Amino acid sequence: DIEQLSFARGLAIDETNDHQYKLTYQNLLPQSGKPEFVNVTSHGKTILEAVSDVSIKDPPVYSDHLKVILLGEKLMRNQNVDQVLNHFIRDDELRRSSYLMAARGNAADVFTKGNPKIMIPLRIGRASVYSQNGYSYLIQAVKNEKGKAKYDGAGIIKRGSNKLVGFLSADETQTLSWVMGTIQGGVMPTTDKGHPITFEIKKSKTKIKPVIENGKPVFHISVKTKGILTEDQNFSKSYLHRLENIFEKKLERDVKQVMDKLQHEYKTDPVFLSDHIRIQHPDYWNKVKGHWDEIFSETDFKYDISFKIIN
Ligand SMILES: [Cl-]
Ligand SMILES: [Cl-]
Ligand SMILES: [Cl-]
Ligand SMILES: [Cl-]
Ligand SMILES: [Cl-]
Ligand SMILES: [Cl-]
Ligand SMILES: [Cl-]
Ligand SMILES: [Cl-]
Ligand SMILES: [Cl-]
CATH class of the missing domain: 6.20.190.10 (Nutrient germinant receptor protein C, domain 1)
Structure with a gap:
């Protein structure tokens, strides 16, 4: 206009x-x-x-710098976030370490007068480089739950447009982070024959092996996690192997749901899966580079999840 x-x-x-x-x-x-x-x-x-x-x-x-920038939902959905930051914020108001975050709803409402992570937290340094290099990525989300601010999953910023195309819930973000190996800590609460059981993460590692077969990629993801257990009803032997299987299967079905949303709802890879095929398969990568999201949507995943209780 x-x-x-x-x-x-x-x-x-x-x-x-x-x-x-x-x-x-x-x-x-x-x-x-x-x-x-x-x-x-x-x-x-x-x-x-x-x-x-x-x-x-x-x-x-002296000239001080902004510690945190919080972006409102409507703004992120309608505008290239890199272009917005550039337009409204002087370079000398920001530092490499300034935090960037997303708000569900209005950002101004999330800040509230005083009382008396991990996503990743995203810093301006990284976020700007992601935008400039054509990467989709996640940004920690916060929500004023009446409110009372609270971490609440992650926004999904799509490549090219640099716009937010959706949110992942806290649980979905944990699941995705767990399988990708970027998780630091956390708990998985579930049940065994109706009885509450919880698995608290102590250390987790992920190995990703992409194999092209044929024309489309197949990601073999291995997850090895060690953790503490909490029980109800009331040792082992096979009974721990049994509980391990329950936790393992839950992570698997939960990540399948999230991956389905990434592939067919949002249609983008915001977790740098692309980088793994770049390292393992440069030639194939060279051909698909320009339409990686299309390939990502058609990609198959095979998970090998192994949990170990040490409690
Ligand atoms: Cl006018
Ligand atoms: Cl001052
Ligand atoms: Cl909106
Ligand atoms: Cl001015
Ligand atoms: Cl005043
Ligand atoms: Cl960093
Ligand atoms: Cl939609
Ligand atoms: Cl990275
Ligand atoms: Cl192309």
Whole structure:
């Protein structure tokens, strides 16, 4: 859509009736005894801020940087996030280590006045490099659950557009992270014949072996996890092998559901599976590079999950 032209900028600075500063920028109307500069094509941005007499009097002595940037859902769904950050944030407001996060719903509502991970956490350094290099990726999500902020899964940012195409739940994010080997800790609660059993992760490792057969890739994923157990009803021997099997099968069916959403609902690989075929199969990679998501959707997965209780 076409907007009216303006080549010069002006600024109004006011103090309002409810005591706050209001800066209204102005897009000055191009001119061909009256005050001509007053005419605008449109008003520009407005800045609202409460500032104390002491803060007008005492200027800042150094340039600080943003620690965390939280992006609202509607913004991420409609706009290239890299382009947005570039447009609104000066490079010197950010550091490599500044955190980037996603909000379900409105981001401003997630920040709340005081009382009295792991995704991964994504830092600006990495997120920007992902965007620039055509990678889909995950960003930790937060939600104001009435509220009370709370970590709540992950946003899925798709390559090219750099837009959020959906969210994974906390459980789905844990499952995906577990199978991919990026998980640090966590618990899997389930049941054995109705009795609650929980498996707490101590150490987990994943090996991924992609094999092309034929024209499409087949990812052989191996998951080895050691953990602690919690019980109800009430040692072993085969009984631990039995519980291990229950936990193993659960992870498998849970990851199948998540992978199905990635392949056929969202149609993107936000966990760098692409990198494994790049290392193991450069020639094949060279041919598919330009349409990896298409290939990802057609890809098959074979899991080998092995749990070990040490409690
Ligand atoms: Cl206009
Ligand atoms: Cl400005
Ligand atoms: Cl104030
Ligand atoms: Cl300061
Ligand atoms: Cl929305
Ligand atoms: Cl890092
Ligand atoms: Cl959808
Ligand atoms: Cl990575
Ligand atoms: Cl191509």
